[PDB]
Amino acid sequence: SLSSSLKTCYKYLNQTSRSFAAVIQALDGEMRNAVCIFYLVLRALDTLEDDMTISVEKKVPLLHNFHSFLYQPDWRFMESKEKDRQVLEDFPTISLEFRNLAEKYQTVIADICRRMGIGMAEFLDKHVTSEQEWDKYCHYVAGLVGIGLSRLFSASEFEDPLVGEDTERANSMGLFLQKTNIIRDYLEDQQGGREFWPQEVWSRYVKKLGDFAKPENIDLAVQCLNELITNALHHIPDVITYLSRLRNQSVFNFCAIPQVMAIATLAACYNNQQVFKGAVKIRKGQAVTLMMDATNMPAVKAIIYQYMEEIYHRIPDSDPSSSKTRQIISTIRTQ
Active-site residue list: 137, 184, 194, 254
Is 18 annotated to bind a ligand? Reply is yes
49 contacts: CB under 8 Å, gap ≥ 6: 59, 63, 120, 141
Is 115 annotated to bind a ligand? Reply is no
CA torsion, points 45, 51, 57, 62, in degrees to nearest 10? Answer: -20
Is 46 annotated to bind a ligand? Reply is yes
Q: Is 258 exposed, middle or buried (CB count within 10 Å of its CB: 0-12, 13-18, 19+)? A: middle
Phi-psi region of 246 (alpha: psi -120 to 50; beta: other; left: phi over 0): beta
The CA distance from 138 to 6, in Å, is: 30
Q: Is 180 exposed, middle or buried (CB count within 10 Å of its CB: 0-12, 13-18, 19+)? A: buried
- What residue ranges do the domains of the chain occupy? 1-335
Is 185 annotated to bind a ligand? Reply is no
The CA distance from 69 to 306, in Å, is: 45
CATH number of 1-335: 1.10.600.10
Residue 79: CB atoms within 10 Å: 11
Is 293 annotated to bind a ligand? Reply is no
Resolution (A): 1.5
